[PDB]
Structures are given as C-alpha cells and as structure tokens.
C-alpha cells in the first residue's frame, strides 16, 4: 500500500465517505476518540473491544492518532511501519 506518515504530529485526517472510524474501549480517552484506516494498528488492539463506525454525511470527524489527549496507551501508528 501507499503511506504518508504524520511523524511528530497528530493525524487529523478527515474521514472519507464509506470509511471506517475505529474506536477502542480500552485505549480511547472516550467514545469520541477515533482512528483512520491509515493509522489503526490491529497489533495495538488484539484483545481490545474495537468498534467501527462508517463515515456518512451525519457521521464524520478527524483521526486522533498522535493526539496524546485521546489515548490511554501509546499507539503505534500503522503508517510508521515499513
Ligand atoms: Zn489517521
Ligand atoms: Zn497515525
Ligand atoms: Zn486498544
């Protein structure tokens, strides 16, 4: 796949229509904390309760990967893998 890292900052990517918004009960500060397809690392969340929402006109937002305020645990952004 293609990759564009956001090293040293937050992701903040606006979700595209049809795309999943990933949330994790264990890792997220709260239920508004979400991760995009570029960033969500399945390895961070193996035995966690992860849910996906789907981006629409009413359901939108920005990816919180790299926003320290959004996460209990250190995330390993999928984009950073090579
Ligand atoms: Zn992201
Ligand atoms: Zn990321
Ligand atoms: Zn998690």
Curated annotation (Swiss-Prot):
Residues that hold Zn(2+) 4 according to the record: 49
Sequence positions that bind Zn(2+) 3: 24, 27, 45, 48
Zinc finger (UBR-type) in chain: 9-82
Binding annotation for Zn(2+) 1: 6, 39, 65, 77
Superkingdom: Eukaryota
Residues holding Zn(2+) 2: 11, 36, 39, 63
Subunit-structure text: Interacts with UBC2. Interacts with RPN2, RPT1 and RPT6 from the 26S proteasome.
Family designation: Belongs to the E3 ubiquitin-protein ligase UBR1-like family.
Function, in words: Ubiquitin ligase protein which is a component of the N-end rule pathway. Recognizes and binds to proteins bearing specific N-terminal residues that are destabilizing according to the N-end rule, leading to their ubiquitination and subsequent degradation. Recognizes both type-1 and type-2 N-degrons, containing positively charged amino acids (Arg, Lys and His) and bulky and hydrophobic amino acids, respectively.
Protein name according to UniProt: E3 ubiquitin-protein ligase UBR1
Taxonomic source organism: Saccharomyces cerevisiae (strain ATCC 204508 / S288c)
Residues of the full protein shown: 115 to 194 of 1950
């Amino acid at each position: 796949g293609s990759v564009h890292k956001h090293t040293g900052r937050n992701c903040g990517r606006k979700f595209k229509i049809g795309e999943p918004l990933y949330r994790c009960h264990e890792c997220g500060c709260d239920d508004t904390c979400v991760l995009c397809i570029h960033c969500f690392n399945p390895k961070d969340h193996v035995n966690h309760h992860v849910c996906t929402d789907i981006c629409t006109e009413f359901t939108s937002g920005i990816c919180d990967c790299g926003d320290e305020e959004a996460w209990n645990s250190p995330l390993h952004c999928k984009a950073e893998e090579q």
